[PDB]
Design a protein around this ligand. Sequence first.
Ligand code: NI
Length: 418
Amino acid sequence: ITNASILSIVYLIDLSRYGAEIYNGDKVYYNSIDKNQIRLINLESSTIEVILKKAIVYNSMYENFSTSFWIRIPKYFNSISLNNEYTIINCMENNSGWKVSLNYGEIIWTFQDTQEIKQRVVFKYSQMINISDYINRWIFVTITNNRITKSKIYINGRLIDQKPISNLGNIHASNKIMFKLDGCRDPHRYIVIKYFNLFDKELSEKEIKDLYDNQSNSGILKDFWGDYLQYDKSYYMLNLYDPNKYVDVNNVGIRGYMYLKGPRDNVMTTNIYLNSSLYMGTKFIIKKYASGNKDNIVRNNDRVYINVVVKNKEYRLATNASQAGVEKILSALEIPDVGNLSQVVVMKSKNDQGITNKCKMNLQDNNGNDIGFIGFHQFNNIAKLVASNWYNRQIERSSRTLGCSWEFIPVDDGWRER
Ligand code: NI
């Protein structure tokens, strides 16, 4: 696969041996926390142009190739976006070549020969869904092309669609790849992209999985959207075991508790989307404690505190590890009164073998013994938040979703709630 790399863009430069030239328009935006994330908006000046050396300009009936990239597509919210295929990554020249385009709920690959014969492959996702894996969340796209079998589109390493392409003839693509919203009716539309790559082979399923795993940066925790999780940033909490609930606090202090309540409200716009509201419940803020890194990113194994916002004031998530029973009920404590109560949380994305898990917060007692991952337990019809080593034992056996599986959801411009 490294031998197969013919374009590999990072923050912008091409790391490949072909050293593509890259030109950015005046209205490209690079994310401050992760400069590899490039945002393109619906303006003529919001462009990236990549110029490929002659040696790798595609002009063949037979040569195989693949592309991979990550994309984050804001929720479609207005009818102007319905029935509107717009190009985003264009390598067509004189009506032959390849392009990536989007439409309402779609990511589309088009491959076109010099006789105007076209094949497409399409990933479809719904916006009428409780919780989506795709809307406004980072998606890893991979498209592979084998000239004597099929074009194939993979999403997060999984095969979605494939179509025969053996009837396509010579395909003569451009020496320029234009990253630009082209033909988009919605003035507010944008995309975010990262890690654009080309390969001079059809990638195997294993290669695709390994690319997904490696480019995921699994040593850094992620928020719900797939961005790096951060310190000093307000997050709404989603429990993946029961996504219809949200967190609330029934009194501050050590006799109070946090609990899960439901149902969530709907958010909807007729014939455009119907989802659960994400911006509900008690906000959590992760506080830097042990990390010596100067940046603001939360890494696997960082020891942190968790603050909880109650009536616009920060409290400390904590428990008395000496309480009866081994499901330790969590409370929201006044920060000056926490004392030596249990409050240090080990943040987790993956285990020592590299196996990822959505269980994020492993609470420690004051002696550094695990009290357990933070999840919930039902005490007489109330689902109270607890730390429990039951989770820790289960996470050693599988990576399935458990009650300790959480997402941290910050307010993001690609998911607007009324
Ligand atoms: Ni329990």
